[PDB]
Ligand binder design. Structure first.
Ligand SMILES: *[C@@H]1O[C@H](CO)[C@@H](O[C@@H]2O[C@H](CO)[C@@H](O)[C@H](O)[C@H]2NC(C)=O)[C@H](O)[C@H]1NC(C)=O
Ligand SMILES: *[C@@H]1O[C@H](CO)[C@@H](O[C@@H]2O[C@H](CO)[C@@H](O)[C@H](O)[C@H]2NC(C)=O)[C@H](O)[C@H]1NC(C)=O
Ligand SMILES: *[C@@H]1O[C@H](CO)[C@@H](O[C@@H]2O[C@H](CO)[C@@H](O)[C@H](O)[C@H]2NC(C)=O)[C@H](O)[C@H]1NC(C)=O
Ligand SMILES: *[C@@H]1O[C@H](CO)[C@@H](O[C@@H]2O[C@H](CO)[C@@H](O)[C@H](O)[C@H]2NC(C)=O)[C@H](O)[C@H]1NC(C)=O
Ligand SMILES: *[C@@H]1O[C@H](CO)[C@@H](O[C@@H]2O[C@H](CO)[C@@H](O)[C@H](O)[C@H]2NC(C)=O)[C@H](O)[C@H]1NC(C)=O
Ligand SMILES: *[C@@H]1O[C@H](CO)[C@@H](O[C@@H]2O[C@H](CO)[C@@H](O)[C@H](O)[C@H]2NC(C)=O)[C@H](O)[C@H]1NC(C)=O
Ligand SMILES: *[C@@H]1O[C@H](CO)[C@@H](O[C@@H]2O[C@H](CO)[C@@H](O)[C@H](O)[C@H]2NC(C)=O)[C@H](O)[C@H]1NC(C)=O
Ligand SMILES: *[C@@H]1O[C@H](CO)[C@@H](O[C@@H]2O[C@H](CO)[C@@H](O)[C@H](O)[C@H]2NC(C)=O)[C@H](O)[C@H]1NC(C)=O
Ligand SMILES: *[C@@H]1O[C@H](CO)[C@@H](O[C@@H]2O[C@H](CO)[C@@H](O)[C@H](O)[C@H]2NC(C)=O)[C@H](O)[C@H]1NC(C)=O
Ligand SMILES: *[C@H](N)[C@@H]1C[C@@H]2C[C@@H]2N1C(=O)[C@@H](N)[C@@]12C[C@@H]3C[C@@](O)(C[C@@](O)(C3)C1)C2
Ligand SMILES: *[C@H](N)[C@@H]1C[C@@H]2C[C@@H]2N1C(=O)[C@@H](N)[C@@]12C[C@@H]3C[C@@](O)(C[C@@](O)(C3)C1)C2
Ligand SMILES: *[C@@H]1O[C@H](CO)[C@@H](O)[C@H](O)[C@H]1NC(C)=O
Ligand SMILES: *[C@@H]1O[C@H](CO)[C@@H](O)[C@H](O)[C@H]1NC(C)=O
Ligand SMILES: *[C@@H]1O[C@H](CO)[C@@H](O)[C@H](O)[C@H]1NC(C)=O
Lengths: 728, 728
């Protein structure tokens, strides 16, 4: 008999997806790690040599976390003693190894506890951040030049982000931007002097007698934000002057009038940089285009080259204003912007004309611009078959916009409906990554005629293993509400029979611009629930969801905790109408925004749901950070949106939890959604005499992702769902 | 058929015990609050007058928390704006009402946020502590004299205790001691400069955007302790123009050689004070007897008058060295000390003689000396019927030790086996307070011929109510281990039938010198479990337990988490073989030390217990405070007892929790047993893959005693026990 996909299968990673992670080092070659050996592959023919033997660093004395090779191929940066900070940030030690002379460098080493390091884009200059200040090495073995002196722990950040810029603005820790040939180093400086601190206990190993208090500058909604400045230094002057001058580029007057953010930095040429700025009220953004002036040594941004983007129905961009892609000469650029119908499409700008030309259109959206050549622009969209949850690679002829070719749509239509892409240095080659609905498939292509050169990884090994398992199926479809299609997916038990009635778990996220119905193949907890426990696991993308235009996405503007919550309840009613759901056994669960929505649904008094699980939920918008929260909610003041901030809390719905079984879970060291949020939910439930189940996870963060904690939480949740559904 | 005692009855206080709380104001009269009116009673005849009408302060404008009348009856201190701190400490505002004028005092008022206030023992002087400094008022409407100028929040404490002296040494916030006629004010000063802080989050009301971090100087085991100094000031020679001179009494040389504590302060005469000092290794203590020298102005403690008290088998005293009771002339004293066999009895000392004479003896213990006259010493003991869990009042004739009279034993032997007492100022009269096994009974007596004057409160109203309820019964008996009897009690369901098999819950505390098997009448959770759920609730006093001599009490010296744990298991094993216990349904629960023992038992692998609940448990002795932990454990150093500190943790037993159902509960704002302790238990269980149930209580402290939290925790625990025992 074929076994099912069990909880242990999921928790012990018995059935692993194979990857093919490569790193392009040129237009024709990439690096790849095969059994600890770093190999160089030739793209055209597929042959390889050993770049770095696995035995090279056997006597190093430290486990190597990662490597980074200089762009000129002369040096390799070895990263070790990795200590994670937030989602992207960490500290590490670094050694540099000379490849041409086969030697480690012991002279003038990068310090321990270095926060960030990057090679220049050409050659082998290094910039790094240490104790919140920027340093530059022209040569790996020579003394560093200090660039900034103002760095101060938790206060002034030079060339790295503070908590909120890392998580909500840049999705990155770095704040250093080398010019294309490495002459200039641009950087941001953040000042968190008056930003309040979130404080929480960290217990550590049992040996630690007194708990540590972690203290992090973190602006909650409406609080004092960090301020920002932007600078550019000429690194070629460093060896000639004792102290090189950092030249400030100031934000536009339209930004300086109040609170604002720096939201994009993009080099256009050797001597031209674009900066995007965003008002704290995030429906107005300004792009400056700034040129170096040789005679004055200053950077000037002509107003004739300033571009404004605003939104009358919501915020700017999906999560921020989109990034520009400059043509080689730097005199024009392409950018995804919302069109007059509210659909995100590629627009083409000359740097000194304010009106752009849309080069794509239709009732679907461009997801990202991936590459730009003299002849073609390459982009990912969900055009194909009008499925907003699919992703394909297209190219558009720059001399004739009517000529658009899909490069991935027909490669394997049944197996592959969701693609991402990685182009070589000048887009001569590309790797396609298919992630579903079948098993992941990695292929390599040449851009001249888009020929498929070879299959890199086809997951044949996993395919063989899964033959002996009763795997669930997946249905992706839509329901029509008020003349609008809303997409859903169901993970269906093996041998699914529509004449029978199944328990159902609604797996919710539902944050603005999110998508939970797609064509991606996943091996996760839902796979187990469907395969082993015969539970249907459903998800629904309602109002506020992404990739379907602004009419849908902006529906929850200034009104979080309303329509997107109502639409999950309605989805459950619609699934019941399909005839194969046991209406006595409907449950709901989610994590973060999904935890908030789960809790709001459970507190609604709808009577639809028997039970639910909230993991690390938001409970009150005033407890979450300014950049994310205010994007959708504006400010929590009587003059703006305080009334809605106050009636969209989980705590106000406490009395209605009397009608449901609730399990509330939170990691105690969650720096993102603070434990505070669940502590206030539990207190409110206690105050009204509602019984519920709880679990804290000591020292876990938002991911609850340590190997043991991951296994424990899914085990605890599994018992709860099974009890709720009367399943042995 | 009649109702049972329900969970709601317990939680809503449906059946209330009546009290009779009086305060003696002389040898002949006492005060008593009846219907908010304060009445004065004549002891001899029982007639009364209204002292203060309940309407006097109708226009006061504040809710009055408490009152304190001056010893001369001329003033009343009114306490309001009460804000709780720790177990005993709080701050408050104070007004003073002048009874001669019938007016509130409007000048030179006691400051807001006052930490402690006390009248002199005679007359109407006041001493108070505000912002950690001591002040004295000679008359209530006159300006205060500032005694100390060194007070500093969290650092220097004058006349009040720090966290650990409050909880573990004096069981009080005050560290001020007036001489008998009010001439001198003695005080301690605590210095916490190098004591590390426990830090934990406090979430407050939902309106608070950022959690607050609470920081308390708290020495965990082996950490830097507070240091102490002792001073005496003459309040009769205070000046408006000169700062007050405090005279220091330094600790003896035998104490100064290392870390030590001040553990007792007792005035002997108007010009003689006794102090007891205790080494940090608490098996050695010294009493100094210090006389005022009217010509030098010093306090001199003659070496010839020092008294050493040491223990070879354990620590000194039950929880600290006992208080002396000085004779009229202050030249001799009576004190409870452990005799040669290890039983605590009254010893009679001359102040300048090394050897004392035991005036009581036997294999039972004196609980406390309650009053001393020239003729008689009055004491409470468990002599009667050799029952260590009973308490009676005795007097011994000081001129003839063969003449011992039990004053309470025969008053009402079926109803009353556990007494406490309150004597009038010079012991002309005493109130007896019986607390079981029947309903509490309060009576008044005269000392001259031990006449029973009147019944003050007999709880006949509650008796009438309980006749309509199926109440449980209580069995008190013993089992014999190694020729030693160990006492247990069982709360037995109504209509108990020994041919039937009942589930059993073992209610455990089992801390050193504790007693859980006694003759006290209680209305509590156990009452409900037995009455309504038909569960037997048993408790057992094994090794380490109190009031039965040092052989038993000192058995766990340097070895907490050994014999007292093993003895609970052995007890339950014996119970499980009794023909009326279902061996498949035995549970265990406890709070604090009881949570520790519950957890240690559940991690023992004994297999005896199906499930258990630990509330606010200790998990590792290095996490608890120095004064308590080291008394039993010594220091956590390789040279002392580190190995046993490391072997006695809950965390080390995590693997054994695989075969039990465990529920772990802790208040997040517990300043006593820190949330840290349970956070470490949960992390250990997660690390070995053990599933368990958890509940945190936001902003609750060690008591989990807010109205709503109290109701919630017992509701949660009730569901858990009922599910464990398969009860509907
Ligand atoms: C990073 O830290 C390591 C380990 O502390 C440093 O290596 C040595 O550490 C030992 C003590 O363990 C000391 O004797 C020296 O300070 C170090 N000696 C040498 C030869 O390195 C190391 O120095 C640190 N790295 C940098 C770049 O400062
Ligand atoms: C970062 O911002 C702070 C202001 O929030 C600046 O620090 C000072 O702030 C104090 C009080 O907030 C003022 O008295 C000063 O005028 C500010 N300036 C200085 C020089 O102390 C601070 O200067 C900023 N730091 C940097 C590096 O820009
Ligand atoms: C990197 O780019 C910079 C900026 O364009 C180049 O430096 C300039 O070169 C031009 C012409 O070669 C000179 O007129 C200027 O004096 C230079 N300006 C500055 C600020 O340096 C530089 O040539 C490039 N570097 C390399 C290695 O090609
Ligand atoms: C950006 O959003 C703000 C806040 O909604 C808009 O502010 C206007 O001013 C106040 C509220 O701040 C109201 O009296 C107006 O009705 C708001 N206008 C609206 C809601 O349309 C501001 O108009 C927005 N900017 C853009 C370009 O749409
Ligand atoms: C209890 O009763 C006695 C009277 O028997 C009270 O003593 C009397 O007090 C009143 C006024 O205070 C005087 O007029 C009498 O002269 C007193 N008589 C005696 C014999 O002393 C006593 O005050 C009462 N006590 C209380 C508390 O009400
Ligand atoms: C205790 O605090 C109260 C309130 O702050 C003080 O109240 C006084 O009366 C009003 C408000 O009730 C204030 O405007 C005055 O400043 C206060 N002063 C006086 C002289 O009454 C009160 O005084 C404080 N008590 C003490 C003893 O400091
Ligand atoms: C309270 O205790 C501290 C010691 O913990 C005393 O302060 C000094 O402590 C430092 C080390 O922390 C030593 O260098 C000094 O010798 C100590 N005292 C002096 C006077 O130098 C502090 O003085 C004490 N305060 C009081 C009021 O007793
Ligand atoms: C309270 O006790 C004190 C201390 O014994 C008494 O004051 C002493 O007694 C006499 C007063 O006549 C003097 O010789 C001493 O100088 C006093 N000592 C001090 C330290 O002041 C006082 O008399 C007692 N009070 C009463 C009312 O008897
Ligand atoms: C009080 O207890 C301490 C420690 O338990 C005893 O100290 C002795 O001396 C040193 C210092 O710790 C140790 O090496 C010895 O082993 C201790 N002797 C023992 C445990 O017998 C001290 O003896 C005890 N005091 C009394 C009166 O028994
Ligand atoms: C939960 N995911 C958390 C609470 C609310 C929704 C916001 N949360 C975040 O962590 C945000 N920092 C991000 C920001 C973007 C968009 C997200 O939907 C997903 C994310 O990875 C990137 C994290 C919410
Ligand atoms: C729990 N009860 C806690 C942990 C360990 C046993 C000690 N605990 C205390 O709170 C102590 N501070 C006290 C000290 C004495 C004796 C006790 O048994 C009871 C108490 O009220 C007085 C508190 C333990
Ligand atoms: C691949 O093969 C070509 C010859 O066919 C050779 O020139 C090249 O060096 C090889 N590349 C690698 C990375 O082995
Ligand atoms: C370098 O110059 C900057 C800007 O004037 C100044 O703040 C800093 O102190 C200087 N550093 C040194 C070492 O002179
Ligand atoms: C009393 O002592 C304090 C603190 O040293 C000082 O500020 C004050 O002036 C002193 N008063 C007199 C009268 O000396």
């Amino acid at each position: 008999t074929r076994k099912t996909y069990t909880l242990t299968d999921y928790l012990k990673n018995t059935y692993r997806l194979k990857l093919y992670s490569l790193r392009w080092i040129s237009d024709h070659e990439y690096l790849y790690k095969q059994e600890n050996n770093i190999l160089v592959f030739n793209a055209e023919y597929g042959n390889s040599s050993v770049f770095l033997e696995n035995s090279t660093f056997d006597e190093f004395g430290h486990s190597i976390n990662d490597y980074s090779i200089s762009p000129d191929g002369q040096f390799i940066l070895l990263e070790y003693n990795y200590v994670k900070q937030w989602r992207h940030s960490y500290t590490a030690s670094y050694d540099i190894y000379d490849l041409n002379k086969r030697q480690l460098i012991t002279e003038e080493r990068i310090p321990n506890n270095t926060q960030w390091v990057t090679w220049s884009p050409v050659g082998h200059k290094l910039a790094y951040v240490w104790n919140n200040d920027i340093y530059v090495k022209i040569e790996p073995n020579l003394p560093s030049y200090r660039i900034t002196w103002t760095g101060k722990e938790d206060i002034i950040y030079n060339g790295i982000t503070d908590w909120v810029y890392e998580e909500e603005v840049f999705s990155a820790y770095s704040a250093l931007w080398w010019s294309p040939n490495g002459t200039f180093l641009a950087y941001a400086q953040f000042n968190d002097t008056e930003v309040p601190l979130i404080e929480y206990s960290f217990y550590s190993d049992e040996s630690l007698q007194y708990p540590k208090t972690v203290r992090v500058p973190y602006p909650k909604a409406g609080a004092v934000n960090p301020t920002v400045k932007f600078f550019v230094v000429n690194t070629d002057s460093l060896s000639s002057v004792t102290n090189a001058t950092s030249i400030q580029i100031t934000a536009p007057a339209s930004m300086l009038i109040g609170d604002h953010y720096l939201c994009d930095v993009t080099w256009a040429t050797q001597e031209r940089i674009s900066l995007q700025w965003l008002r704290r009220i995030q429906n107005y953004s300004v792009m400056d285009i700034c040129d170096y002036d040789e005679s004055s040594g200053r950077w000037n941004c002509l107003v004739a080259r300033q571009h404004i983007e605003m939104s009358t129905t919501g915020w700017v961009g999906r999560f921020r204003p989109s990034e520009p892609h400059f043509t080689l000469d730097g005199n024009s650029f392409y950018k995804i912007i919302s069109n007059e119908e509210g659909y995100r499409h590629i627009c083409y700008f000359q740097i000194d004309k304010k009106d752009c030309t849309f080069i794509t259109k239709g009732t679907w959206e461009v997801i990202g611009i991936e590459a730009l050549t003299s002849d073609y622009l390459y982009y990912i969209s969900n055009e194909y078959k009008g499925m907003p949850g699919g992703r394909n690679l297209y190219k558009i002829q720059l001399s004739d916009y009517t000529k658009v070719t899909c490069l991935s749509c027909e490669l394997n239509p049944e197996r592959c409906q969701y693609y991402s892409v990685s182009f070589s240095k000048e887009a001569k080659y590309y790797q396609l990554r298919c992630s579903g609905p079948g098993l992941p498939l990695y292929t390599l292509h040449s851009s001249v005629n888009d020929k498929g050169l070879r299959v890199l990884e086809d997951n044949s090994a996993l395919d063989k293993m899964l033959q002996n398992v009763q795997m669930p199926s997946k249905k992706l479809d839509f329901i029509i509400l008020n003349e609008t299609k809303f997409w859903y997916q169901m993970i269906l038990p093996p041998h699914f029979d529509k004449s029978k009635k199944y328990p159902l778990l609604l797996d919710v996220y539902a944050g603005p611009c999110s998508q939970k119905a797609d064509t991606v193949f996943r091996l996760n907890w839902a796979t187990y629930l469907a395969s082993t426990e015969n539970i249907i696991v459903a998800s629904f993308d309602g109002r506020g969801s992404g990739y379907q235009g602004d009419k849908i996405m902006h529906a929850i503007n200034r009104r979080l905790g309303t329509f997107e919550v109502e639409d999950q309840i309605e989805a459950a009613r619609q699934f019941s109408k399909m005839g194969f759901v046991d209406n006595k056994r409907i449950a709901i669960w989610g994590w973060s925004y999904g935890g908030y929505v789960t809790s709001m649904v459970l507190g609604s008094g709808s009577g639809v749901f028997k039970c639910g699980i909230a993991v690390a939920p938001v409970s009150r918008w005033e407890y979450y950070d300014s950049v994310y929260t205010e994007r959708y909610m504006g400010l929590p003041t009587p003059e703006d949106n305080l009334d809605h901030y106050r009636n969209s809390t989980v705590m106000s719905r406490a009395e209605n939890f009397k009608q449901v079984e609730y399990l509330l879970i939170h990691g105690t060291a969650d720096d993102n959604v603070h434990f505070q949020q669940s502590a206030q939910i539990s207190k409110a439930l206690v105050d009204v005499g509602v019984d519920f189940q709880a679990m804290w996870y000591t020292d876990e963060d938002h991911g609850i992702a340590s190997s043991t904690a991951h296994q424990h939480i899914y085990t605890h949740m599994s018992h709860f769902i099974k009890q709720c559904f009367s399943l042995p």
